[PDB]
A paper describes a structure:
P-type ATPases, including ATP7A and [name], are responsible for active copper efflux that is essential for maintaining copper homeostasis in mammalian cells. These two proteins are also known as Menkes (MNK) and Wilson (WLN) disease proteins, since dysfunction of ATP7A and [name] leads to these diseases, respectively. ATPases contain six metal-binding domains (MBDs) that share high sequence homology with Atox1, a chaperone delivering copper to [name], and exhibit similar copper-binding properties. In summary, tetrathiomolybdate (TM) can react with the metal-binding domain of ATPases (WLN4) and form a Mo2S6O2-centered protein dimer.
Residue numbers in the entry:
A (entry chain A): 1 to 72
B (entry chain B): 2 to 72
Write the structure that this text describes.
Amino acid sequence: TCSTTLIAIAGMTCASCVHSIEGMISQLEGVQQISVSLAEGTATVLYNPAVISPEELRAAIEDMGFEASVVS
Amino acid sequence: CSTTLIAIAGMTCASCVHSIEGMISQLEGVQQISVSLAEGTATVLYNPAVISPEELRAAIEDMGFEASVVS
Ligand SMILES: [Ca+2]
């Protein structure tokens, strides 16, 4: 079964980037779905914790040039 | 839900109005959309946890109509 993680993402200011983040993160092994809220500055990720971790997700987002933090 | 008003240029037929309604209304997070051909606008009721005015506007633009968020 999937777990959920909430990640704060700073610096998102366009639709293009929302879609780019969702595309990149969704394709990682174990990621079922990612919902980015441009309004709230967050991503909610449904993932298989046996194969990927919140800190791996966070790190992938950072690598795209956004500051990111696992909230919960 | 939140509400956004989007100005859309170039709506000059019923078929396009309905196309935009269909495409936008079916996006995840979108509860309702009303398009005004006379006023050149769409009013969208949406869940900001899931979708933004910026994304709505970009989706309309991707269909071939110039769009801007008014409020
Ligand atoms: Ca999305």
